[PDB]
Amino acid sequence: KMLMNLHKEQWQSGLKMYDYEEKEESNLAATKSMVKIAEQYSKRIEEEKELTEEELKTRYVGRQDPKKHLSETADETLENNIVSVLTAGVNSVAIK
Amino acid sequence: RHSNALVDILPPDSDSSISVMGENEKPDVTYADVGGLDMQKQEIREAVELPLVQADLYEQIGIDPPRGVLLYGPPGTGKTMLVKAVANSTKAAFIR
Amino acid sequence: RLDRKIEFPSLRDRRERRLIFGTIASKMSLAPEADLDSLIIRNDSLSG
Amino acid sequence: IETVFVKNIRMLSFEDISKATHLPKDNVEHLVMRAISLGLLKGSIDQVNELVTISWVQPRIISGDQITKMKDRLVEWNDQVEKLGKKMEARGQSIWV
Amino acid sequence: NFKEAAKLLVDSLATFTSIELTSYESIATYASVTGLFTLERTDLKSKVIDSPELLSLISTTAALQSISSLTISLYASDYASYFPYLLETYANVLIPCKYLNRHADFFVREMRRKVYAQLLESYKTLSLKSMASAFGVSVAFLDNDLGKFIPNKQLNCVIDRVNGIVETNRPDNKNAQYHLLVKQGDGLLTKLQKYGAAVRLT
Amino acid sequence: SQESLVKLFTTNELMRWPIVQKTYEPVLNEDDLAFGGEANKHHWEDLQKRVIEHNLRVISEYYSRITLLRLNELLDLTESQTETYISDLVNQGIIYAKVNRPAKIVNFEKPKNSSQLLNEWSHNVDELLEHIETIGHLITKEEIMH
Amino acid sequence: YQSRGIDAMKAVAEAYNNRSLLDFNTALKQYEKELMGDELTRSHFNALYDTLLESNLCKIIEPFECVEISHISKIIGLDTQQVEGKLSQMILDKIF
Amino acid sequence: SKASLTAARTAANSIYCPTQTVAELDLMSGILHCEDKDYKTAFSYFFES
Amino acid sequence: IRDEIAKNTELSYDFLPLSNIKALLFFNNEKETEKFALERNWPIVNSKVYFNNQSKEKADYEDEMMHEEDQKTNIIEKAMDYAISIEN
């Protein structure tokens, strides 16, 4: 318990919704970036009935797979936006 | 550092030399400082700059787009001058 | 190669001498005492 | 400074000030302007909407009754924290599952 | 369709063969009308009127003259001569021409809408009265023509009859981006529902 | 003479044009070559422009929306003069205002963005919290000791 | 060489330098036939007139928000109907 | 206008053709560049002509 | 019919003369028209009705119940229920 500690700023950062300038930027940038790799997700799967996993990645240049990257981007911006709307709604209803 | 292994790539800095001049040290000469030579200018502008500005235009015709451009004349004609101007307005890389 | 071949005049017509003298005016306002046109006549072989 | 602040609404029409400081509306705005200059308040004057909307205050005098008005004012928003603290706890079934 | 026919027709003005094909005078006139249907007033002048293989013939029949007079006067924002030139275009382009006597009604609806669309993005809370005297039309016809397109929402505009004021409430804002985004995301959803459910049964 | 004169404009404060015109004419016409030269007599006209220009900058902070009808009293200039002297200041790029020509309202405030306005709320909420933390250990301190 | 259009050139030039549409409007009416007399003179003088009106218009409306068009026509020095028809044409392009 | 302005220079041998025809030829370049929005090139031709 | 037109006429009018409400909801006395007004909790003060007054009190009735709070669905609730489906 001593080694770990409990932070007094753990409670302040919970109850602070970050600046909104950085949030217009966050949504804007993220949604735009997923258009470039969304297109390449089609080209991967034009065929998929071909044998060998490495083979699929060598024909259409699916190296560091567009399925895995695009999904990953979808899960990680999604985690942040749910938490941000949560923090914002908590502060406004709580404080006054 | 503690044990070599590959973790990141960097921009190229070596084995290809430096012989570039940037856009941050670009000539102060422009097409506006160009006085005379206005007939021939149009053909240079079309030869260097237009493939950049409208690539689609070449494709449409299906014309193999221009290549080398000899500029020539006796000395003091202004050749070095003209090509100083090309370097600012191309908005692209420059090797002299 | 080698598609576009650009020729320059270097003797220059009066039309092209005038333009490079005209660069002076663009660059900076000049005196009514000045006459550019005097310079175009006397030339015979003069590049930029 | 006393009349707007003592209320829980922070934005107040010029009229109420006018009978209070026994001055017409023209001097109300001048009083307000003088304070901002002096660095006693920071805020705005609107003679369009006829409002003074203050947003920074320099410390008030101590008195028992001022204490009482601060203590009552926290009550209002203490309720909201406590009621919300039950809602959020209960909710979530994947809090560490 | 007229939308695509603008492209096609102007590019056949460049290179044409008249052997086993309609007169040239016809293509030139058709080309103008198609311009109206597809393009906004701003790009009317750049892409159809300034085309140099429409200004080599100039005008050489009644039908090209009536249509040419209209196109320019609509961009020029003289609506005084516009309503008179509509009468001319009915006469010489729609009725003689076989292919346009079949969109004899569609033309009327279209070109009243098109005029009304140019003022109403460039004006807010203007009289009916002011608009009639400019147009050269009666007031009574004008009230009735605007109300064709209000219910379909191609003006998105509403008219005070009480004081003759013609109001403007056009979307173009944040709400406008919201309506486009939801019409797409509603269609995506319906598709995901049917297709998902299908794969799941089999 | 110098002391009173200067402090008025150093500090941000409203000081009417007729008070300057009357008071400071006999004080400063004595010294020559700024107000008592013959070429500098007509620098009293340029005293008028500066006081009111000052008046408009102070008012810019302090108001955010004002009627034009009020503003004529604040500067003591007439309606026609008020509108005109604001419009030049927008060209010299000292202020931004929107000026309504029918003698309506004059707003010295800025077009804003959604984001910017909520940045202030981001700060009020943080600082409020900051206070709740400091308060919490000061209360304990006075509890035990007193 | 001396023509009525040599007289036009000096009138128009001085007018455009002033930024005065009043001097311009008068000059266009009295020297209307000199513009009809040549295509090149005619095309450019009207593109010069339209732009002169535009340029001077932005300054009046530079504060923005409820500016009378009676106020505008005063400065401009032309009839209300002439100014209003310019006002509609330019809003449509969407340049303010 | 350009296509056959160029064709004029190629089918002539400079401006060594009669001095009158050169006036007319210089005048015609003059119009065309003025429309392209080059007024230094337009002025220079027109002066020569 | 008389009870049905009161419902329609809340949304239509904000206030009416007592002689106008009389004509519309059909009555042969002004004792009937005001009795009908005060059933629908609309003051008859100033000799005008005030339809908006009943609308306020219906809205309060709804806010006291817990059937109106979750129909709205608050933004704290929506995000948290959104979060646990994913992590499930």
Ligand SMILES: Nc1ncnc2c1ncn2[C@@H]1O[C@H](COP(=O)(O)OP(=O)(O)O)[C@@H](O)[C@H]1O
């Ligand atoms: N069209 C022109 N406008 C202005 N100056 C010019 C022009 N042509 C040449 N000059 C002048 O001539 C100078 C020398 O020309 P440069 O381009 O170095 O010539 P070359 O390679 O033909 O020997 C330039 O620096 C410039 O000052």
Ligand SMILES: [Mg+2]
């Ligand atoms: Mg060299």
